[PDB]
Design an enzyme around this catalytic site. Sequence first.
Site, mmCIF file in Angstrom:
data_model
loop_
_atom_site.group_PDB
_atom_site.id
_atom_site.type_symbol
_atom_site.label_atom_id
_atom_site.label_comp_id
_atom_site.label_asym_id
_atom_site.label_seq_id
_atom_site.Cartn_x
_atom_site.Cartn_y
_atom_site.Cartn_z
ATOM 1 N N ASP A 35 0.827 -1.204 0.000
ATOM 2 C CA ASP A 35 0.000 0.000 0.000
ATOM 3 C C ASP A 35 0.860 1.252 0.000
ATOM 4 O O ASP A 35 1.353 1.664 1.046
ATOM 5 C CB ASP A 35 -0.891 -0.033 1.245
ATOM 6 C CG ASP A 35 -1.794 1.167 1.358
ATOM 7 O OD1 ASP A 35 -1.956 1.864 0.341
ATOM 8 O OD2 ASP A 35 -2.339 1.402 2.469
ATOM 9 N N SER A 199 -0.584 15.520 -12.107
ATOM 10 C CA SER A 199 -0.833 15.144 -13.487
ATOM 11 C C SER A 199 -1.067 16.396 -14.324
ATOM 12 O O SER A 199 -1.584 17.395 -13.838
ATOM 13 C CB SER A 199 -2.043 14.204 -13.555
ATOM 14 O OG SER A 199 -2.436 13.947 -14.891
#
Length: 330
Positions: A35, A199
């Site tokens: 994770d 992004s």
Amino acid sequence: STGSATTTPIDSLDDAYITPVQIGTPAQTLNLDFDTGSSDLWVFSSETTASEVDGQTIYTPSKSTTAKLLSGATWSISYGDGSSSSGDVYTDTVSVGGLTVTGQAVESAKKVSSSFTEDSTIDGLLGLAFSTLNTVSPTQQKTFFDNAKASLDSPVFTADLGYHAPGTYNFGFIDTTAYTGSITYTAVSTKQGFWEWTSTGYAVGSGTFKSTSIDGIADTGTTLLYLPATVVSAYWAQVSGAKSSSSVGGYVFPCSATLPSFTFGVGSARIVIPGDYIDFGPISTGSSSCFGGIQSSAGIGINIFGDVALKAAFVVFNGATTPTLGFASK
Ligand SMILES: Cn1cccc1CNCCc1c[nH]c2ccccc12
């Protein structure tokens, strides 16, 4: 040193991925969910409340000659989906894919919430976010990666998650045969303890690319792709019959649909998530309403590039002094 381990979807939807991990001496092998959105290595154990264990493999520290109680240490964690676990702490030897760390904090669960109990395939989590998020008190502990880093050939790990198929986590090297083209690296902020990056935009299907900054986290431990409501609405508007259902808890679409792809930007590069990756199947057995793999982050407080996004790429978690993230197509 290096390590290399195969990671395997837990079910037919790729809801999560499990990776075998050797703990203790002799080894006890548990299948953990790696994770990158948390920083605790915790396991089902001989200390876990019996009614909260249902089929998991447990760690029994009393059977490990290298286990030692970390005196006074406790831990307690809550995850983004509302699940939780807590307990006490041992140090022991932990190996992943041939890479061994001695003195790793292994957090033994005394209590786990229902969605852990009900997930028989997940024996615990192995956190790979920054150690500043580790919950052990009164002395915070380091992640497996942070402990291994100095010994690694290169201070990196990579995630290569499969679509309805196994994949690979590598530590200490970049497998140049595992991706196509070049890897594009992008800046990371560690201020919130996550692999947080920005992004450069998105496209829906064959549509034009929208240049827009989207700050989010690369999170292998979250199933779906959670993005701003504007972006998500633009995606689902291209699927006939798709709608947001408050009763279900997000966007659903007709199971008869063919889903468009979704592209996200990494610098001037582009990662394309095929439409099929966005299908999470019937909301309930036999239903013709299917759950979408792209959902709104509104009310989460952060955008999350979970498995839906990451499994479309070969992803480098560069833990150099100034961390960065790399993405390649594959
Ligand atoms: C969101 N939704 C919509 C309908 C039913 C849902 C909930 N789907 C949960 C799928 C699941 C089972 N085990 C897991 C382990 C980790 C992550 C996810 C899962």
